[PDB]
């Protein structure tokens, strides 16, 4: 039932010195070449697609046709998303078997499973290890992207950061023995770094910790200020305000590390026992006080605030944060707009002086990050009318709210979507199943909220723009799935494609239409199912036209079969935005080619 092979570098097994009885000892030469190459060349870059063709002899594959099929798989390993798989059937099917010599002196038909067994070995014992030996796969934390960084420069990076923590006081060696929480990792940021802990799966604890946070979140609601909602807050604020809105957003510098444990202990210790009894309180206290980590065989005590990556930090930073709110932010104008996430405050007022003071008040309490400050205060050099907050873009002048999309230059869009579920595998003979599991509505529901579909403060044209933007991401996933169908399922007829697509267009438009009517407001004029279906189809057109030489038949089908007249019962709506790929979506990569 195991149909999947993970491209991940944790599937790698250690290669033996020679080879046991089963394996054709033709690969043993390449295995010995692994230790020869590991014996330190070494120049930049020497491509991974070039090292392997020399270490593994060309006589393994036979012809230079089979070699082309195998090195596609190796190329997919070097461009992978997190949790990505291909089929095992890819590793043996459509190969020329007669050209392979070391398989000729063997059963003519028992070859598929033997070729597959040997291929597995090559990937697991040479390919992946020699990648992991030369490189370090790092999560950029932007979707499921994995950037490949040279192991050499990453360790010099790690020693530069490990230096600061050792030289400062943030990290102190314990010596020793006393059971670390997990392993310390130094992950890159923008120009900065990030110090988190990879937790040992000691579970146990997992459901225990899950119970602790559940009860600290019960304390926060019953005791501390019920801190808004964020649709209600903005909705009411815009309704009451008649003038020009002024607003500021501040990012707090390392919020977890700025928490004072002494203060936190007093708070955890302040809770009534019916909400949290002493036994759990006492435990949380010392658990917050005794943060132990391992880095390089040696164990360390972390004592700069809360450790990022611990199960409890999230809710306990939130406990501390809400206390800072009661103490310092309890006197804010009751006619102003106030909201805060974790380390993001968002203050808005018609009165520029009130916003100005909040900045001074906020800059006193916390050490804010000045680069990330977005505001339209006349005091600022380059004032922003639209500010990002909670995955939404708030415009202070128009009061319109749009979805924010985190898409950097030349980012391989396929990284946003997780197409492969290793716990729930789909075999290579059922692409239809795969395509529907991918078109499942949950992945885009976060873009299908009241914040986009209301006509309370959003104009009608804003609603359509939001739906179109959503549907653009759907088409990109659809595209991402098809590329996975072409090179893994190797599809027969593409008959189901039309049925799924039609269902997808028709389903999401009905979901939008439902949301629109529900969160209807005074700015509503008239929306129709016909209009939304049109928008939905055109959203697919714009993305499909990025691969005309593949979707020629599909585009032709849509244009001839579906209705596409861009007709709105509104006059302020520009129809040209709907017949083109939105600009934040142009510069994303659709092509895959082993970068490093
Ligand atoms: Mg933030």
From TrEMBL:
Main location per the UniProt record: nucleus
E.C. designation(s): 2.7.7.49
One term under GO cellular component: nucleus
InterPro entries listed in its UniProt record: DNA/RNA_pol_sf, RT_dom, Telomerase_RBD, Telomerase_RT, TERT_thumb
GO aspect biological process, one term: telomere maintenance
UniProt GO molecular function: DNA binding; metal ion binding; telomerase activity
Keywords from the UniProt entry: Calcium, Chromosome, Magnesium, Metal-binding, Nucleotidyltransferase, Nucleus, RNA-directed DNA polymerase, Telomere, Transferase
Binding site for Ca(2+): 251-252, 343
Gene3D superfamilies: 1.10.10.2210, 1.10.132.70, 1.10.357.90, 3.10.10.20, 3.30.70.2630
Annotated catalysed reactions: DNA(n) + a 2'-deoxyribonucleoside 5'-triphosphate = DNA(n+1) + diphosphate
SUPFAM superfamilies per the UniProt record, alphabetical: DNA/RNA polymerases
Binding positions for Mg(2+) 3 per the UniProt entry: 251, 343-344
Domain of life, source organism: Eukaryota
Residue numbers binding Mg(2+) 2: 251, 343
Top-level class of the enzyme under EC nomenclature: transferase
Keyword Ion transport included in the entry's annotation: no
Residues annotated for Mg(2+) 1 binding in this entry: 251-252, 343
Compartments (UniProt record): Nucleus; Chromosome, Telomere
Binding residues annotated for dGTP, in chain numbering: 189, 194, 254-256, 369, 372
Domain Reverse transcriptase residues, every copy: 168-394
Family: Belongs to the reverse transcriptase family. Telomerase subfamily.
Record's function text: Telomerase is a ribonucleoprotein enzyme essential for the replication of chromosome termini in most eukaryotes. It elongates telomeres. It is a reverse transcriptase that adds simple sequence repeats to chromosome ends by copying a template sequence within the RNA component of the enzyme.
Protein name listed in UniProt: Telomerase reverse transcriptase
Organism from which the protein derives: Tribolium castaneum (Red flour beetle)
Record lineage: Eukaryota, Metazoa, Ecdysozoa, Arthropoda, Hexapoda
């Amino acid at each position: 039932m195991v149909h999947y092979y993970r491209l991940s570098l944790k599937s790698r097994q250690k290669a033996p010195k020679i080879v046991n009885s089963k394996y054709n000892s033709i690969l043993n030469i390449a295995l010995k070449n692994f230790r020869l190459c590991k014996k330190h060349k070494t120049k930049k870059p020497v491509q991974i697609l070039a090292l392997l063709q020399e270490i593994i002899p060309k006589s393994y594959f036979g012809t230079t046709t089979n070699l082309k099929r195998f090195y596609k798989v190796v190329e997919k390993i070097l461009t992978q998303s997190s949790f990505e798989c291909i089929h095992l059937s890819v590793l043996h099917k459509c190969y020329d078997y007669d050209a392979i010599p070391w398989l000729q002196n063997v059963e003519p038909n028992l070859r598929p499973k033997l070729l597959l067994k040997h291929n597995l070995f090559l990937l697991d014992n040479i390919v992946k290890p020699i990648i992991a030996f030369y490189y370090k796969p790092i999560k950029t934390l932007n979707g499921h992207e994995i950037k490949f960084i040279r192991k050499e420069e990453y360790i010099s990076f790690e020693s530069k950061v490990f230096h600061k923590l050792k030289k400062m006081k943030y990290l102190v060696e314990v010596q020793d023995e006393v059971k670390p929480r997990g392993v310390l990792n130094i992950i890159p940021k923008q120009d900065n770094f990030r110090a988190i802990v990879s937790i040992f799966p000691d579970s146990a604890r997992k459901p225990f910790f899950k119970l602790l946070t559940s009860k600290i979140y019960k304390v926060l609601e019953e005791k501390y200020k019920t801190s808004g909602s964020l649709y209600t807050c903005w909705s009411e604020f815009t309704q009451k305000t008649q003038g020009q809105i002024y607003g500021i957003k501040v990012d707090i510098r390392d919020a977890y590390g700025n928490v004072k444990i002494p203060v936190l202990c007093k708070l955890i210790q302040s809770i009534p026992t019916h909400l949290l009894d002493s036994e759990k309180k006492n435990f949380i206290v010392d658990h917050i006080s005794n943060q132990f980590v391992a880095f390089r065989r040696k164990i360390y005590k972390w004592n700069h605030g809360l450790l990022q990556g611990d199960p409890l930090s999230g809710c306990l930073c939130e406990l501390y944060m809400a206390f800072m709110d009661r103490l310092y932010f309890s006197n804010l104008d009751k006619d102003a707009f106030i909201h805060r996430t974790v380390d993001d405050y968002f203050f808005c007022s018609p009165h520029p002086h009130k916003v100005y003071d909040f900045e001074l008040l906020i800059k006193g309490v916390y050490q804010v990050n000045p680069t990330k400050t977005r505001t339209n205060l006349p005091t600022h050099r380059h004032p922003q009318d639209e500010i990002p907050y909670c995955g939404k873009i708030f415009n202070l002048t128009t009061r319109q709210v749009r979805t924010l999309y985190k898409l950097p230059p030349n980012y391989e869009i396929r990284h946003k979507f997780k197409l492969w579920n290793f716990n729930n595998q789909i075999s290579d003979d059922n692409p239809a199943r795969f395509l529907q599991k991918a078109m499942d509505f949950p992945f885009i529901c976060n873009s299908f909220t009241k914040f986009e579909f209301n006509t309370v403060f959003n104009d009608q044209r804003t609603v359509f723009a939001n739906f179109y933007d959503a549907m653009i991401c759907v088409a990109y996933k659809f595209d991402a799935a098809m590329m996975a169908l072409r090179t893994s399922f190797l599809v027969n007829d593409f008959g189901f494609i039309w049925l799924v697509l039609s269902s997808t267009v028709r389903a999401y438009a009905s979901r939008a239409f439902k949301k629109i009517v529900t969160y209807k407001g005074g700015k509503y004029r008239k929306v129709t199912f016909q209009c939304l279906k049109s928008i939905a189809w055109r959203a697919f057109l714009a993305v499909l036209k990025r691969r005309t030489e593949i979707y020629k038949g599909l585009i032709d089908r849509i244009k001839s079969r579906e209705k596409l007249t861009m007709k709105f019962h509104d006059g302020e709506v520009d129809a040209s935005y709907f017949c083109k790929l939105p600009e934040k979506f142009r510069f994303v990569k659709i092509n895959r080619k082993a970068s490093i």
